[PDB]
């Protein structure tokens, strides 16, 4: 795609993650499962909710037109009335629909650029304490605890504490 | 004990807010306005040519020839003519001004 | 507005359980997280209970943590409540209604809605005392 | 619990404000709501998300965020303002909703 989150390097869905719409999915011998974020998914529920609110405000606005009778000698008066009820039909026909094409573009858009900003943030919270795959996965070279884990949901993770295991585990 | 560098984007004391399909009252660092929303609540010349006022009457009386009327009179120019609500110096004598509407848009050019 | 009705309402005795309730209908309900909010009579508001659209996520208040117990029939669209220890110190009125919270309270289907539910059903008094 | 502004005032037509304050509990990391309580009446939904307005549309009602802290203003406030008015957080610290009970005004009367 465009920022190749989405339909990228992570090919797939997860059909089992119903926690929300951005989340992680970690697998170790104490567990397994997946569990969104709860920040990035608010932000971006928020996000289109306000468009969407936005979008519905905006046209609002009603155009009223209503076709009066015509005289046999008023076909002037009824063709200009026809052609700017058509060309006002067809302002706002033209109008909604590019809108709308637009804007799930860009929608789809940010939800692959959400994806990958939060695959960016666990990079950069684990520069060289852990591997990176071509599936969006990261493979920690000294293995995490649950508490690890939530650590790095939150953003709370700790590098001094696991970078000496980290540097002596990643040989071998 | 160590050297530093950043990378940041520039911050204000500004207060103005602009809005966004994402998000809404959002505070900016510039922000320009594009409506116009204050007016001098007066009547000013156009291409600096006078305008016309009744302030009594009517274009009906005017253009007829009320005698309460005649300050309006001779060889006159203008750019847009007023006309006031409350008027009460128009037809007298009792009557039609036929197409007076289309008098009074052949009148405004 | 949209349909809606309590039960449990009037004067209860203290000392005793209190079991309220309310059923709302207009459209589908089964699929929304609900709340339920205090008011003191006069001033003040403090928010009492949550309940998600299948019932997984508790999550009691501070005052009443653990003291009160909330449920909902989806098949029948109510909304139950049951609590003990009952004092004056909770003599006030109380709302089911539904209130902005987070996205993981209501369903997978209804995370984004033009209108979010602004709907803050009517007041149900309790008044103890002797 | 959350921190309420005693009362408010404004004359009709001079955009009255009202604050409020939290934490990073509560309003720093979530979005903060809005309600209204008219007399006696069973209230209504103001804003949610922080500045949208519902299908209610009232649209002289404003609301921000910043950080800690949240605002609400309304432009005009005729005569059907004068009623209890209330602020509303997450406070993801703990889980249930938390209130800041009671701010009322009055206008230029």
């Known amino acids: 795609g465009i920022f190749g989150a989405i339909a990228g390097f992570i090919e797939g869905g997860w059909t089992g993650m119903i926690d929300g719409w951005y989340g992680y999915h970690h697998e170790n011998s104490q567990g397994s499962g997946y569990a969104a974020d709860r920040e990035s998914t608010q932000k971006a529920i928020d996000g289109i909710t306000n468009k969407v609110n936005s979008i519905i405000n905006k046209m609002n606005t009603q155009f009223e037109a209503v076709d009066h009778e015509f005289s046999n000698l008023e076909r002037r008066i009824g063709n200009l009335n026809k052609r700017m009820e058509d060309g006002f039909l067809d302002v706002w026909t033209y109008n909604a629909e590019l809108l709308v094409l637009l804007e799930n573009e860009r929608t789809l858009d940010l939800h692959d650029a959400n994806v990958k900003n939060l695959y960016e943030k666990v990079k950069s919270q684990l520069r060289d304490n852990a591997n990176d795959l071509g599936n969006g996965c990261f493979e920690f070279w000294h293995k995490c605890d649950n508490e690890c884990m939530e650590s790095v949901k939150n953003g709370t993770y700790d590098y001094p504490k696991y970078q000496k295991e980290s540097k002596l585990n990643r040989q071998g | 004990p160590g050297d530093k560098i950043c990378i940041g984007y520039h911050a204000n004391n500004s207060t103005t807010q602009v809005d966004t399909l994402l998000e809404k009252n959002v505070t900016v660092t510039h922000s320009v306005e594009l409506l116009e929303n204050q007016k001098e609540k007066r009547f000013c010349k156009i291409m600096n040519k006078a305008p016309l006022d009744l302030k009594d009457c009517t274009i009906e009386g005017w253009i007829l020839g009320n005698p309460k009327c005649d300050l309006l009179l001779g060889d006159q120019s203008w750019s847009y003519i007023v006309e006031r609500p409350n008027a009460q110096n128009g037809i007298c004598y009792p009557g039609v001004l036929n197409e007076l509407e289309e008098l009074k848009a052949f009148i405004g050019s | 507005q949209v349909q809606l009705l309590e039960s449990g309402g009037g004067v209860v005795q203290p000392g005793r359980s209190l079991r309220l309730s309310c059923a709302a209908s207009?459209?589908?309900?089964?699929?929304?997280?609900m709340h339920w909010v205090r008011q003191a009579p006069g001033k003040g508001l403090e928010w009492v209970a949550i309940?998600?659209?299948?019932?997984?996520?508790?999550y009691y208040a501070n005052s009443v943590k653990g003291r009160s117990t909330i449920s909902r029939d989806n098949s029948k669209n109510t909304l139950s409540l049951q609590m003990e220890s009952l004092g004056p110190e909770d003599t006030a009125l109380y709302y089911c209604?539904?209130?902005?919270?987070?996205?993981?309270?209501?369903?997978?289907?209804?995370?984004?809605?033009?209108?979010?539910?602004?709907?803050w059903g009517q007041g149900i008094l309790v008044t103890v005392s002797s | 619990m959350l921190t309420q502004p005693p009362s408010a005032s404004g004359t009709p037509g001079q955009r009255v404000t009202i604050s409020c304050s939290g934490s990073?509990?509560?309003?720093?990391?979530?979005?903060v709501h809005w309600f209204q309580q008219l007399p006696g009446t069973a209230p209504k939904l103001l804003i949610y998300?922080?500045?949208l307005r519902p299908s209610g549309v009232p649209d002289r009602f404003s609301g921000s965020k910043s950080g800690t802290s949240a605002s609400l203003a309304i432009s005009g406030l005729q005569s059907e303002d004068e009623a209890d008015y209330y602020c509303?957080?997450?406070?993801?610290?703990?889980?249930?909703?938390?209130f800041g009970g009671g701010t009322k005004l009055t206008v230029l009367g």
């Open positions: 990073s509990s509560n309003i720093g990391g979530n979005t």
């Open positions: 309940i998600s659209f299948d019932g997984s996520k508790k």
């Open positions: 209604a539904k209130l902005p919270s987070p996205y993981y309270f209501d369903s997978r289907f209804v995370w984004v809605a033009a209108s979010a539910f602004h709907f």
């Open positions: 207009g459209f589908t309900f089964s699929n929304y997280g």
């Open positions: 998300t922080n500045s």
């Open positions: 509303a957080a997450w406070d993801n610290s703990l889980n249930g909703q938390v």
